[PDB]
Write a protein that binds this ligand. Structure first.
Ligand SMILES: *[C@@H]1O[C@H](CO)[C@@H](O[C@@H]2O[C@H](CO)[C@@H](O)[C@H](O[C@@H]3O[C@H](CO)[C@@H](O)[C@H](O)[C@@H]3O)[C@H]2NC(C)=O)[C@H](O)[C@H]1NC(C)=O
Ligand SMILES: *[C@@H]1O[C@H](CO)[C@@H](O[C@@H]2O[C@H](CO)[C@@H](O)[C@H](O[C@@H]3O[C@H](CO)[C@@H](O)[C@H](O)[C@@H]3O)[C@H]2NC(C)=O)[C@H](O)[C@H]1NC(C)=O
Ligand SMILES: *[C@@H]1O[C@H](CO)[C@@H](O[C@@H]2O[C@H](CO)[C@@H](O)[C@H](O)[C@H]2NC(C)=O)[C@H](O)[C@H]1NC(C)=O
Ligand SMILES: [Ca+2]
Lengths: 71, 71, 71
């Protein structure tokens, strides 16, 4: 079935609805992570920005200075 | 004239002093542009600066001309 | 100056206004012509559709059967 016709400049179709992204999926992160708290199957993980590494002995805190959230 | 001239403008053009020189107005509704795309023709009011719907659900359009109010 | 931005499907711009085509230009045709009355500098001329010719001795009437105007 056809829907509509538009410019050859069209690049994507994306459905804007809430049921497409289940909003009741709880984030497993326990706020422990310093900078980033990436997800993984059944849990999460810690990471820090490019060109930085964890403080020696710890797998949570990284040496890079924190930055305030943008308004 | 002898070392002089007048920038008169023909019937249907009111003389309107403008920026960087004087011009003569359109003595009526501001001009529309006609803008043909492969699938539709579009209108645009040069003063109102708004598109408005015209010939739609067409295909392989290429060129446009008009006859002013024949009837 | 830039006016507006549209598809690469854009194939013309044409100003839709009455002053753009002088409406007070009288047609010199005297209704004498049978099928077509084309214009020429300072006057007009007679012609008939392709694959037809004038009735012998006349430069107005052509042998092709007339057709009613379309509603
Ligand atoms: C979006 O994801 C949420 C989970 O983050 C889904 O909610 C769960 O849906 C199941 C479907 O049948 C329910 O059972 C869950 O209720 C709970 O389930 C656990 C077992 O896993 C029980 O121990 C609890 O007692 C309770 O019955 C429900 N969980 C929550 C937290 O709501 C939801 O279906 C999903 N929605 C869509 C549209 O995908
Ligand atoms: C659109 O074309 C018409 C002609 O079809 C133009 O009208 C003529 O404009 C001239 C400009 O100065 C007038 O003089 C004409 O008036 C007539 O002038 C002759 C002498 O030259 C007299 O014999 C007539 O009695 C009459 O006064 C005028 N003619 C008509 C028939 O109106 C018009 O300017 C033009 N408009 C645009 C916007 O291009
Ligand atoms: C284009 O826009 C102009 C305004 O910039 C319109 O002109 C006005 O149109 C209303 C319509 O009711 C008239 O009452 C006003 O007198 C007009 N104002 C001026 C400045 O003349 C114009 O009608 C528009 N045309 C189209 C077809 O959209
Ligand atoms: Ca002079």
């Amino acid at each position: 079935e056809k829907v509509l016709v538009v410019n050859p400049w069209l690049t994507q179709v994306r459905i804007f609805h809430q049921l497409r992204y289940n909003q009741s999926v709880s984030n497993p992160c326990k706020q422990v992570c310093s900078h980033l708290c990436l997800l993984r199957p059944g849990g999460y993980s810690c990471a820090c920005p490019q060109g930085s590494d964890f403080v020696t002995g710890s797998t949570v805190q990284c040496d890079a200075a924190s930055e305030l959230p943008v308004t | 004239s002898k070392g002089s001239y007048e920038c008169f403008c023909v019937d249907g053009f009111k003389s309107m002093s403008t920026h960087y020189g004087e011009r003569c107005a359109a003595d009526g509704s501001p001009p529309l542009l006609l803008l043909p795309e492969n699938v539709r023709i579009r209108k645009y009011n040069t003063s109102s600066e708004k598109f408005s719907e015209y010939l739609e659900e067409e295909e392989h359009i290429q060129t446009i001309d008009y006859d002013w109010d024949p009837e």
